[PDB]
Amino acid sequence: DDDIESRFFIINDNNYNENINLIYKDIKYCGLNIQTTGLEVFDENIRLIQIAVENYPVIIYDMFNINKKDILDGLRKVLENKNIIKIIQNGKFDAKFLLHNNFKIENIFDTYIASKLLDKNKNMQLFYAARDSSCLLKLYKKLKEEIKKENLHIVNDIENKCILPICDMELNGIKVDLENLQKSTNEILNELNIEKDNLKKKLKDENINVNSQQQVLKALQKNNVRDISNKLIENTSDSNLKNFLNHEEIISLRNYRRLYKLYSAFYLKLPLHINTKTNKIHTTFNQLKTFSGRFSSEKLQQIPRQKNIREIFIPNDNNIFIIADFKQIELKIAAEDEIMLKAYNNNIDLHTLTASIITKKNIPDINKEDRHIAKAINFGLIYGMNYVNLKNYANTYYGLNMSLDQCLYFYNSKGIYKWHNQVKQKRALQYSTLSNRKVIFPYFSFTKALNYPVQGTCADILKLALVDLYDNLKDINGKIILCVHDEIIIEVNKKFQEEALKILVQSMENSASYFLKKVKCEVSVKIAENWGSKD
């Protein structure tokens, strides 16, 4: 009860008709799907291969009943032909299987990524193999209206060109040094036992459960732990613990807790998710499961940035990491405010600027603490917080001893004013980025309206940089390793180091050039043998 091609040819050793390859002559695109025996590319086999050519029954290669390599020759040609688009559903899975089975492939259109982009993160056997192979032709036709027709053109085309870089990143993985891992685990464990012993001595109770909040609270009350104001401790929250630093017990307790979360929540949890036959971890990246459109990962961005932890990630033998970052990509995206644009054009830092406005100092007299405070003020107020919320956010995440009257002065102290007033007045629910990626709110939130275009444009820029990088790296067999925040990490042989550095820089600069017309980005790049070298 539809118009999806449901007839098919079946290819085996007994009926192989060479003339079938004449269907491949002068085609531009075709729907491609496969059927496998399971989910693990290393443990499973390809049961079927489906190729749907327009107006023809699907050519189905029965791989469990094919043993002459010649039968797949014309197939390999289609796969190798850089001028034939392969339309696929779940392109990573099929490409993974084809690569593991020594098939080369290039030019892919994954209809699932495009459909997920039509959704804008709103979250609203042979006959089957034939209809699923041939439906791709019509998805290709319609989803490619939703290329050039839509202005969602830009993002749909770029994510679609980004399909291959994402497969590259997940398939290359990143190698883990288990030595330093278990080592640091034993270290933090010995520090934890030192904490436990020295604190149960400090708690005047050797049998108290240091992991039981009630027992620790009772011991502290018994120990009569009081602050400078002689007030007995009432709760064990770290914020309250900050008020009792005059006692060595709060010292040791906060220490043991920090080391405990570090050890159990990380040193003890991390080994539970690793691959073995390759000693590589292959995490799962979600493309469109965040509100902004940034990448997410599961089973890398929640990994601590401290060099103590990031030193565990190393390149393969004879290779080296190349790490690149955008310098303040979000704020430049926001600028793209007259004062702000002129400052950016004079290469004046936005946080130094805000520090000079709050403190009334001149830019040469602004110190790092001034810039840190200005950073917190900028991220809090630019994204729509009020001074009460600002005080709490600042003290919580930046550890600042500001007063309510101060944050209120900060709040009260032309482009940004106009844009904020426009957002307040319109109270709109639909917003878009410079790629014209779009979102519709369930209700109006000033702060989410301010936050969405910046992060979504950052996502667009990084993804286009990954697309250019993936195309530019083939010549030197470059490997895409990682993308976090506004930074990318690649792994390359050491002899192409500086060349890949330029490729990476030009991959990111051209991407920035596609979106920013009034401001120039800055790329910080380093050559490293570990991920901790950047820090």
Place this chain on the structure above:
DNA sequence: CTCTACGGATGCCTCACAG
């Protein structure tokens, strides 16, 4: 508007057991 893990705390649910 949360989420996650974690132990401690509830909270019934059910089975061997001694009267």
Place this chain on the structure above:
DNA sequence: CTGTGAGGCATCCGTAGA
């Protein structure tokens, strides 16, 4: 012969802890 405290886990839940 048969209700029953006990135990015996089995999860659910609070709050950190983000």
